[PDB]
Amino acid sequence: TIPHLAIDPFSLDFFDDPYPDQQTLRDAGPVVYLDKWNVYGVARYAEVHAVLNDPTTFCSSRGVGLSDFKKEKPWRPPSLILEADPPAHTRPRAVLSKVLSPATMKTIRDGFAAAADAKVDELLQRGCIDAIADLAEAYPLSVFPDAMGLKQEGREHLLPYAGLVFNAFGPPNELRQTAIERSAPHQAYVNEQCQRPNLAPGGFGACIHAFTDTGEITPDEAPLLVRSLLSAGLDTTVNGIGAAVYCLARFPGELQRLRSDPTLARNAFEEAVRFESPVQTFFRTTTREVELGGAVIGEGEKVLMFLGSANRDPRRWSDPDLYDITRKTSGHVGFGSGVHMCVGQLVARLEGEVMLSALARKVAAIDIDGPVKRRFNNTLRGLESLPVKLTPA
Ligand code: HEM
Ligand SMILES: CSc1ccc(C(=O)O)cc1
Ligand SMILES: [Cl-]
Numbered sequence: 001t002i003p004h005l006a007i008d009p010f011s012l013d014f015f016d017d018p019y020p021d022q023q024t025l026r027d028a029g030p031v032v033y034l035d036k037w038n039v040y041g042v043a044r045y046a047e048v049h050a051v052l053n054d055p056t057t058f059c060s061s062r063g064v065g066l067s068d069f070k071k072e073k074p075w076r077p078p079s080l081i082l083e084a085d086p087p088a089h090t091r092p093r094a095v096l097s098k099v100l101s102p103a104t105m106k107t108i109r110d111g112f113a114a115a116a117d118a119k120v121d122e123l124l125q126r127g128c129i130d131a132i133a134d135l136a137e138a139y140p141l142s143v144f145p146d147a148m149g150l151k152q153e154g155r156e157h158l159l160p161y162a163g164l165v166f167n168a169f170g171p172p173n174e175l176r177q178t179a180i181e182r183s184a185p186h187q188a189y190v191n192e193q194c195q196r197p198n199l200a201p202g203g204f205g206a207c208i209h210a211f212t213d214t215g216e217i218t219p220d221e222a223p224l225l226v227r228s229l230l231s232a233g234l235d236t237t238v239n240g241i242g243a244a245v246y247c248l249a250r251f252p253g254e255l256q257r258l259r260s261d262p263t264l265a266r267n268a269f270e271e272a273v274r275f276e277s278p279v280q281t282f283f284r285t286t287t288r289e290v291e292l293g294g295a296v297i298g299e300g301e302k303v304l305m306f307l308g309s310a311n312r313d314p315r316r317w318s319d320p321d322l323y324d325i326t327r328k329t330s331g332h333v334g335f336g337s338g339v340h341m342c343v344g345q346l347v348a349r350l351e352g353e354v355m356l357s358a359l360a361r362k363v364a365a366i367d368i369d370g371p372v373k374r375r376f377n378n379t380l381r382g383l384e385s386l387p388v389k390l391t392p393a
Pocket of ligand 3: 187188191
């Protein structure tokens with residue numbers, strides 16, 4: 001009933017060009033079995049969306065990577081939110097909700113926007129730049145660690161620590177095993193910065209600590225919740241902004257539309273999240289026997305959701321393979337869906353909007369001007385290097 005496939009969705013060849021294999025996965029059936037990792041797979045929008053929206057049946061507390069926490073030790077203490085199920089999930093979620101809230105966005109926006117304009121201005125002085133190191137990485141690094149309230153010393157650990165986290169969701173391939181081997185100093189830095197004394201007042205970090213007297217979280221939960229933001233908060237936005245620039249770079253027609261109406265900046269970002277889906281994949285674990293798309297999955301099985309595939313499913317999207325900054329993106333699963341839907345999406349969108357606004361107002365063209373180099377990671381899709389020539393408007 002369930003087709004078995006030998007595709008390794010965590011292989012360098014798959015990362016290098018996932019799209020044919022992803023159609024192969026959708027078209028094989030609503031539910032496949034991946035013999036490489038002994039794992040159920042769902043690659044169509046409908047089943048990915050269903051799975052995300054039944055947290056009772058498809059739980060996150062047994063881990064959202066390949067590893068099943070009921071079978072193996074987690075490589076670090078479990079996240080209090082990503083790797084928890086309702087009701088444990090609920091209050092720490094509420095806290096990060098209020099911390100990364102509309103009101104908070106109102107306090108950081110001018111600063112984020114200024115940073116974004118200043119960067120684009122700086123890059124136009126150079127002309128030929130690396131849209132990854134000098135933009136996708138540099139810009140979030142200029143705003144997010146400050147927004148967190150991190151001290152300056154040690155920030156080089158942040159992107160290493162993130163690549164470790166996302167690699168560690170993957171199978172025990174060499175990417176994962178090499179990440180964990182190198183992890184010790186990045187863990188030490190991050191863990192130390194999660195303690196209240198090390199976070200500057202007014203920041204996301206000290207804000208999380210300040211929420212520890214309401215009955216929602218206790219003081220011993222706050223460091224791990226800060227850890228959550230230093231795990232998820234940065235590298236995701238680097239690959240999100242990287243994606244958007246790359247799309248603009250490959251669809252000049254859409255850059256020209258964006259320039260003509262910079263208010264499209266925020267949706268231009270949302271479409272780049274759908275189109276590239278920087279967060280490619282996550283697992284759930286079945287807490288019971290379940291019928292899904294007319295196939296039956298037993299208790300305790302890992303189910304792999306192909307978010308990027310879901311976002312290019314021609315069953316859901318018209319011309320999924322086109323970058324369209326005026327598309328109605330509502331319902332894309334690049335930020336997830338349901339009770340775990342990205343609690344940090346207002347920061348990502350803010351960062352993404354203000355950067356694409358800056359480009360929209362200041363840049364006339366973005367032409368790839370050198371070898372594009374992909375960066376391989378078990379969960380993240382994105383580029384190592386994107387050399388572009390920026391033409392001033
Ligand atoms: C382009 C940027 C981003 C993308 C594509 C993204 C993607 C995602 C996805 C797909 C999920 C769902 C995980 C699941 O269902 O298991 C999620 C949850 C989460 N994200 Fe984001 N994210 C982004 C930005 C951010 C930022 C800026 C932050 C923090 C400042 C953040 C923090 C979190 C946290 C803590 C969770 C766990 C929420 C929960 O379990 O309820 N993310 N993200
Ligand atoms: C969806 S990416 C991500 C989200 C949350 C955490 C965490 O809670 O540490 C890590 C990665
Ligand atoms: Cl850690």
